[PDB]
From a paper:
The prosurvival protein [name]-1 prevents apoptosis by binding to the pro-death BCL-2 family proteins. The process of intrinsic apoptosis is governed by the B-cell lymphoma 2 (BCL-2) family of proteins, where dynamic binding interactions between pro-death (e.g., BIM, BAX, BAK, NOXA) and prosurvival factors (e.g., BCL-2, BCL-XL, [name]-1) ultimately dictate if a cell will undergo programmed cell death. [name]-1 is a prosurvival protein that mediates malignant cell survival across multiple tumor histologies. The large, hydrophobic, shallow binding groove of [name]-1 has presented substantial challenges for identifying effective small-molecule inhibitors of this protein.
Our efforts began with the generation of a crystal structure of compound 1 ([name])43 complexed with [name]-1. This compound demonstrated high target affinity as measured in a FRET assay. Inhibitor 1 makes extensive hydrophobic interactions along the BH3 binding groove of [name]-1 while also forming a hydrogen bond between its pendant carboxylic acid group and the side-chain of R263 in helix 5 of the protein. Although compound 1 is linear in structure, the compact and folded binding pose suggested that a macrocycle constraint could be incorporated to orient the molecule into a highly active conformation.
Numbering used by the authors: -195 to 320
The structure:
């Protein structure tokens, strides 16, 4: 479906897309291949939908956090640069784009938020978040405000939520404990409560978004903002005497921004993969290519060592790296999209007063844990049904919920398979499942049948029960390796299509209560 002999690129509208188009024109001059750069709204949400049907751009740019989910869905081509090329970029940038041992994108630049301040209003920035209410009172008396930043995207509030101990997925001993989510701990509550109190005390407004905060800072109305390197170009045009510095501390601890590596992935459905690799390696990831993008909107600390050696001399880049070192590189696990949606809703609801901080972060914790919790129950049920023996591994975090949900699923799911054996057997025979490809075909039908019907626990149990019925068949035909992917497929469609309803039921605790 993607046209051969051209390149279509998607990049966010806050990045240097006109500079990127200049690199595309240089590519066309040599090869005669036209390069079209687009910046659609919500491109990070559109890409997984359109690429799943074989459509979409040839190349997608986004921070690396979204790319593990795309790679898990088979939407990205593996990238295999030679050693000479790999050595030109910092190794930690390649680490950001590695998923299941394979490189799935080219790293471009390292982005971290910093505190940006107007030196003409505030010659010295505040070192702590705690002093911002008094600074706002002093500035309000002269017709100014202390701080405005985007409150609609959780990326900007995360540094404050993480400062006193909030975390997305625990990281210790060089590994993630994906079962350990920290969005509703005391640290996360303290940071979000601080933000909500700034709004309650009229130091900030819940409706402030990217455009509003940018306009206020660039017009000299607010003394400070929180933003990344891409914002510096518009501040330069405004002529505000600005500085870029370390984010304020909270409870004496540094603010911890989630660090993104802007990366370029190649669509697995592209018939232009070799053209895309040539464009990215030999035109974009060069001093001249990155300089073209950087001159339109600054990239941050670029992954290309030769160019970064020059950019690192800029005090704004040193401040960006200082904030990056105090924060953490984002995970790229497929559940990052769910974590971001959950925290986005939590911040918006707490800031507006729709939910208290406790209610908001409890829902965010449920939403963030949903995939792993659902897979634990569904995988265990399918495998024990297929083999006749249960998994001996400990349940882990939220073990009581997992154990009680599995006990409930055994009672209700066994009843579904018993009573509906006729239709289940008839469907299993019509599907003629013999291998991995037949399981993938079953999964596509399963998605639309499940999604279009009514949302209730009885239909959710039927979906999972049919999965167990298929798992028994897979065991019989020596295709036991197909059971875990089937469990992942069932988990995917459940948590993706029914996300809001599942969170509203308190997840699997609601299921246990419903069938008590
Ligand atoms: C109060 O209610 C409850 C309380 C406790 C527990 C359960 C319930 C409950 N509450 C609600 C419903 C049901 C039982 O529903 C069924 C039980 C058995 C069969 C059907 C349905 C309808 C149901 O189906 C599904 N529900 C949810 N997710 C999925 S994903 C999926 C599915 C579909 C195709 C695939 F390839 C793979 C998977 C189906 C599905 C839908 C229809 C199906 O058969 C239709 C008849 N065919 C069979 C084949 N034969 C040759 C011709 C006649 C079958 Cl077998 C399946 C598995 C499906 C529904 O849509 O409501 N139970
Ligand atoms: O707000 C959640 C959002 O955060 C990050 O997105 C950043 C992006 O990394 C920056 O390059 C810039 O565009 O600002 C975005 C925030 O508006 C994550 O990369 C993204 O996945 C997540 O949804």
């Amino acid at each position: 479906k993607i046209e051969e002999g051209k390149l279509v690129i998607w990049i966010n509208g806050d990045k240097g897309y006109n500079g990127l188009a200049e690199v595309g024109k240089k590519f066309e001059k040599d090869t005669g291949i036209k390069v079209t750069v687009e910046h659609p709204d919500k491109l990070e949400e559109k890409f997984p939908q359109v690429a799943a049907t074989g459509d979409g751009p040839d190349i997608i740019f986004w921070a690396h956090d979204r790319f593990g989910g795309y790679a898990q869905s088979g939407l990205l081509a593996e990238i295999t640069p030679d050693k000479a090329f790999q050595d030109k970029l910092y190794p930690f940038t390649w680490d950001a784009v590695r998923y299941n041992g394979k490189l799935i994108a080219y790293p471009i630049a390292v982005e971290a938020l910093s505190l940006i301040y107007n030196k003409d209003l505030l010659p010295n920035p505040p070192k702590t978040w705690e002093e911002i209410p008094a600074l706002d009172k002093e500035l309000k008396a002269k017709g100014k405000s202390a701080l405005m930043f985007n409150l609609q995207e959780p990326y900007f509030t995360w540094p404050l939520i993480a400062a006193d101990g909030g975390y997305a997925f625990k990281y210790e001993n060089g590994k993630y404990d994906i079962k350990d989510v920290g969005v509703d701990n005391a640290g996360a509550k303290a940071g979000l409560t601080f933000l909500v109190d700034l709004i309650k005390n009229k130091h900030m407004n819940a409706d402030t978004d990217y455009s509003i905060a940018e306009a206020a800072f660039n017009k000299g109305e607010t003394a400070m903002t929180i933003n990344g390197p891409w914002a510096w170009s518009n501040i330069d045009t405004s002529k505000v005497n600005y500085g870029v510095t370390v984010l304020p501390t909270f409870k004496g601890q540094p603010s911890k921004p989630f660090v993104g590596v802007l990366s370029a992935g190649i669509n697995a459905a592209s018939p232009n993969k070799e053209l895309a690799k040539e464009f990215l390696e030999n035109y974009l990831l060069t001093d001249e290519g990155l300089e073209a993008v950087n001159k339109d909107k600054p990239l941050g600390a670029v992954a290309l060592k030769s160019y970064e050696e020059e950019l690192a001399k800029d005090p704004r880049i040193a401040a960006t790296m200082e904030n990056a070192q105090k924060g953490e590189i984002m995970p790229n696990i497929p559940q990052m999209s769910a974590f971001w949606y959950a925290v986005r809703t939590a911040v918006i609801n707490a800031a507006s007063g729709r939910q208290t901080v406790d209610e908001a972060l409890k829902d965010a914790q449920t939403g963030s844990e949903l995939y792993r919790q659902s897979l634990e129950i569904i995988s265990r049920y399918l495998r024990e049904q297929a083999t006749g023996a249960a998994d001996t591994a400990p349940m882990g975090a939220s073990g009581a919920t997992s154990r009680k949900a599995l006990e409930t699923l055994r009672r209700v799911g066994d009843g579904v398979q018993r009573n509906h054996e006729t239709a289940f057997q008839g469907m299993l025979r019509k599907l003629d499942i013999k291998n991995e490809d037949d399981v993938k075909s079953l999964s596509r039908v399963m998605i639309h049948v499940f999604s279009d019907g009514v949302t209730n626990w009885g239909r959710i149990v039927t979906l999972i029960s049919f999965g167990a019925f298929v798992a028994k068949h897979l065991k019989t035909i020596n295709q036991e390796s197909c059971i875990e992917p089937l469990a992942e497929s069932i988990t995917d469609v459940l948590v993706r299509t029914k996300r809001d309803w599942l969170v509203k039921q308190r997840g699997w605790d609601g299921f246990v209560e419903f069938f008590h």
